[PDB]
Design a protein around this nucleic acid. Structure first.
Ligand SMILES: [Mg+2]
Ligand SMILES: [Mg+2]
Ligand SMILES: [Mg+2]
Ligand SMILES: [Mg+2]
Ligand SMILES: [Mg+2]
Ligand SMILES: [Mg+2]
Ligand SMILES: [Mg+2]
Ligand SMILES: [Mg+2]
Ligand SMILES: [Mg+2]
Ligand SMILES: [Mg+2]
Ligand SMILES: [Mg+2]
Ligand SMILES: [Mg+2]
Ligand SMILES: [Mg+2]
Ligand SMILES: [Mg+2]
Ligand SMILES: [Mg+2]
Ligand SMILES: [Mg+2]
Ligand SMILES: [Mg+2]
Ligand SMILES: [Mg+2]
Ligand SMILES: [Mg+2]
Ligand SMILES: [Mg+2]
Ligand SMILES: [Mg+2]
Ligand SMILES: [Mg+2]
Ligand SMILES: [Mg+2]
Ligand SMILES: [Mg+2]
Ligand SMILES: [Mg+2]
Ligand SMILES: [Mg+2]
Ligand SMILES: [Mg+2]
Ligand SMILES: [Mg+2]
Ligand SMILES: [Mg+2]
Ligand SMILES: [Mg+2]
Ligand SMILES: [Mg+2]
Ligand SMILES: [Mg+2]
Ligand SMILES: [Mg+2]
Ligand SMILES: [Mg+2]
Ligand SMILES: [Mg+2]
Ligand SMILES: [Mg+2]
Ligand SMILES: [Mg+2]
Ligand SMILES: [Mg+2]
Length: 115
RNA sequence: GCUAAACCUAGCCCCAAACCCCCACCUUACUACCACAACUUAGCCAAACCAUUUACAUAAAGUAUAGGCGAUAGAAAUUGAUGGCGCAAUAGAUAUAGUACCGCAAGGGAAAGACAAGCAUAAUAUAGCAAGGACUAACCCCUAUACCUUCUGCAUAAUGAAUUAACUAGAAAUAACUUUGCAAGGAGAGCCAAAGCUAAGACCCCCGAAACCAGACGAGCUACCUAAGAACAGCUAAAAGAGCACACCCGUCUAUGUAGCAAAAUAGUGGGAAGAUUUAUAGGUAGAGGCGACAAACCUACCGAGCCUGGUGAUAGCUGGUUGUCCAAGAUAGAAUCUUAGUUCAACUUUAAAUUUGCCCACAGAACCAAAUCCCCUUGUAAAUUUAACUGUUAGUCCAAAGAGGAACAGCUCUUUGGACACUAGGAAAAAACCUUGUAGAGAGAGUAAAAAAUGAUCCCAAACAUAUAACUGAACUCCUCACACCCAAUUGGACCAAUCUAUCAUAUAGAAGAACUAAUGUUAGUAUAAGUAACAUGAAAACAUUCUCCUCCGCAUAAGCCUGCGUCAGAUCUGACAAUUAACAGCCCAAUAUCUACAAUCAACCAACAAGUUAUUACCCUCACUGUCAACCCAACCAGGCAUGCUCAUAAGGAAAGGUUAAAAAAAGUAAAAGGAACUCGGCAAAUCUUACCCCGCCUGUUUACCAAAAACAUCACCUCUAGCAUCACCAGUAUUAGAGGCACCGCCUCCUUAAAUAGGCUCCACGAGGGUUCAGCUGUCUCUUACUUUUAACCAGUGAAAUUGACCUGCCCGUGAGGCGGGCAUAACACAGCAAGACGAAGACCCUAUGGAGCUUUAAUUUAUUAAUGCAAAACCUGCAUUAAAAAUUUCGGUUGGGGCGACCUCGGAGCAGAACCCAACCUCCGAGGCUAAGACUUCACCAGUCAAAGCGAAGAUCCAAUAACUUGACCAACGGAACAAGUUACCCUAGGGCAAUCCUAUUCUAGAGUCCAUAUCAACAAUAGGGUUUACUGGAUCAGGACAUCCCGAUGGUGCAGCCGCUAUUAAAGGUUCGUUUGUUCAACG
């Protein structure tokens, strides 16, 4: 800025990003999307839905190398979800647990290390 | 018509593949043959200084991490791995060649081979950016201030260009926009994804410093030193840095010369010339180093720090450049910044896109203490806001107005409202800034706008006109017939396109790219201009055998250097062949071991000194090989220069000062000069003559700034001060009467005259000085005052034949504007030749300012102790590690506004007038101080960063980075107060890039009013007023020639007088003519005869 102290140096530091490379990330899998994938025949609800079968149906795109650890079910679309699925994900809000149980479904949260 | 112009390939560039190749020679390299050794990149460069710091498959990932946490730097785990839209002789390699040539050396480093400019055929005719309108007609008429770049516009204010041809300067990401594919997914793994992804398309130049660091090359020049050599006539004087003076060395003063004979010479005049002298030969000292009788002197022509290669395409807020066509939008609020020669933000500009209000604006409304301004309903309009994406400009000039500063002036600094300029056109003379006028083309149509004067110094300046009806003239404005994108800088958008290559046709559609030159003191080649100019050369006659005239510190030889460089023949105006220089002279040397090796040389004897100057034994009975041998010569680019020694000392040797002519100027050298003899001049410089006296400085001889200073500077005997008790590489084969480092400079003594005239001259201390000043006498063309002759130059004829310079020129004078070129007058047929120097701001060197350029010097400016030296502590009598103290260095910097730059103040924030009435507006203008939590909406110091107010609701009544921190957070400095973490004084040695209508007053005319023995006018004439003219520092003369005005000093004419008269005094008129010589001195005057 011509010698005047630059704008990006007169504003104090704060840990907006400290640790960002190690804060784990999870790709959402909304119930809307799960229903949409089930209907069009991409995932198969007559077979346990793990991460492999979510990806082999191109339902979510997992990036291991960017510190994604897995999927998280999100409550969006709890209404209108009608499917009997045995889904294994890496997180779940209690509303998603409900949405999967109310229709006679089992949901289990597993863990997967980056390797 | 010459000169030229043209061509193809010889080769090369980038890839792929494949791992590539007889003799002599380290001594003086290219020479057959005898007794030591090799083993961290600093820094240019970024941080806009600089100091820590700064780069040398794909993906992960520009992530972790490092970092004045600034600039920037930056992993790993894991993943998986024969060809050419190339050049084609200024290109491609530098290449026909690392040759020629340059340099001592390291090293540098070429060229080329196959009807352009310039001229001729054919010189020109008043006048003028060389053209345009035209015209029957080339000129004549009217119009018309060259181009680029930089400053606000620039008449050329300044910079650049002789001219042609060739070569020569926009490379790329982050987003965005456009067009395709696919679309909740895209992508040929890694990435993105709340319509996004993938692909393509578009956008970021060239030349130039002083410098820095590293490694090489240089002491054949010069500075000094070493070894072993050489020179120094004659006279005077006898052991001396003695006197006069040759060879030799130096270089005082003047003149010539200034691209010269010479990148420092020539001629004369000069200093030394037995010594501290001069000099040939080999060796040594090497660049922050050497050497230095210190001058920043010299180290291979350019040294306040050599040269070459590399880092290097150094960097450059600075200068200069930046190449096809056409159209369109397009300009002067401000803030911060080691900042005002620049950058970033804003404001303004541009494009694409979205949306709906934008501008003008009455009535109402805005405070207590003149102009106008603000705000909106309508109305005339069609624009405005918002979003996405970039560049560019920024502290401009003039005019009207209101203010502040300098008078209410100085064409003066600053703020504000408006206009114009940097855009077109017409007017006021020329004219950026006044008045008139804009949207662009063709017309041999038309209507208008503005627009005319009244009553001191070269040469006045349109010519004229008192009285025939007021209208006409006049633009690119407007109308007319036709056609329309077709007149701004920086910038931005768009439509076209020259030429080349590739794909397909086989000029088009595409794709590419070394893709376009009126301009960089651009580079290379060609040819011009100055120019057939400056300059150069061959003694005479002849019968080519010879004779004559004149000249030389020259000639012959050796050495050094060079290497066939005027011998014959044959071809030309130099090329080839042939031939040569014969060793006795000179070089090329030596078997070993021990021994010795005290006393000079000077005609070497007298006196006298100091600087002190080979063999005995052992081994060998071998013979002349090898090389230089020439010349007109070497170092200076080819040369009035440089070059050691021996002998000839004016020549037995060697040469030629005049191409022919005439006898102009100016110039150069020389000779002569009447009377006077320094009156010249800064000065007796030069020349002629040869004498004297003093004063200042330095004791003397000597040395120094190669190439502007030879001195009053350096050195020097003598004296003094400081340090040092001693081995084999200097001091030193030395030892306190010695050695090194400093100051000073023997010795003795102490710690009013001058001239006619005058600003000049007048601690003791002999001798000396190209030192400085003064004087006597003489001398002389220095001068009063020039003149003649000779030589060179010169001018002409003949031969040979440059260079600076050059935008184009068809190249006048006077006045005005701001000048050969503009305006108004005047002049004007064309053309050589020789002169001159008034003008063409006619073609190196200085001075002021700037750069967060460079290099220094000093320090009590900041940082360091790495290296050394002392200690101190551990380590096994010496070295290693750590710490402290010092010296020695090393790296680094020099804030801002300013009287007239310096001195001195201030530098952030706040309040009052300028800024009278929303907002804002400068000051080194005017006057003063300070250092509870949550949350709708807003205001703001014209950016940002900061800053400010706040309904409701819930609870109680001076920045960033760093360190200490558990913390809740915390501070100093940053006051140069948007802040480098820590840096001053100075450059007379500096280098590069660049910029350059007077307050106070002087004088004359107006009231006379005051005086003058009476009386203003015979004189001063006070203040003031009206006139023409300047005052810059504190808090440029002289010679030479002079042109001009009159405001007249003289001469001329006239009036009054208190001159009763010449002369005086004032006043009018008059510029044809004239307006002296000297002493002292040089802000230039003044004084004096
Ligand atoms: Mg600063
Ligand atoms: Mg720097
Ligand atoms: Mg070539
Ligand atoms: Mg070449
Ligand atoms: Mg021609
Ligand atoms: Mg001119
Ligand atoms: Mg020029
Ligand atoms: Mg020598
Ligand atoms: Mg550059
Ligand atoms: Mg600057
Ligand atoms: Mg326009
Ligand atoms: Mg309104
Ligand atoms: Mg028009
Ligand atoms: Mg074509
Ligand atoms: Mg080009
Ligand atoms: Mg050129
Ligand atoms: Mg001439
Ligand atoms: Mg001549
Ligand atoms: Mg021989
Ligand atoms: Mg012999
Ligand atoms: Mg001989
Ligand atoms: Mg002879
Ligand atoms: Mg001759
Ligand atoms: Mg002649
Ligand atoms: Mg005489
Ligand atoms: Mg002397
Ligand atoms: Mg002397
Ligand atoms: Mg001639
Ligand atoms: Mg004039
Ligand atoms: Mg002439
Ligand atoms: Mg600066
Ligand atoms: Mg500097
Ligand atoms: Mg104020
Ligand atoms: Mg302000
Ligand atoms: Mg603000
Ligand atoms: Mg409240
Ligand atoms: Mg500052
Ligand atoms: Mg400031």
């Amino acid at each position: 800025e011509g010698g005047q102290t630059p704008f990006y140096i007169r504003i104090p530091k704060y840990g907006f990003n400290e640790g960002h490379s190690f804060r784990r990330q999870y790709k959402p899998l909304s119930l809307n999307r799960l229903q949409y994938l089930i209907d069009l025949g991409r995932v198969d609800p007559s077979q346990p839905i793990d991460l492999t079968q979510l990806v082999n149906g191109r339902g979510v795109t997992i990036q291991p190398l960017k510190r994604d650890y897995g999927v998280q079910l999100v409550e969006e679309g709890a209404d209108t979800f009608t499917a009997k699925v045995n889904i294994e994900v890496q997180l779940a809000s209690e509303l998603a647990i409900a949405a999967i149980e109310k229709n006679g479904g089992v949901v289990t949260t597993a863990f997967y290390d980056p390797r």
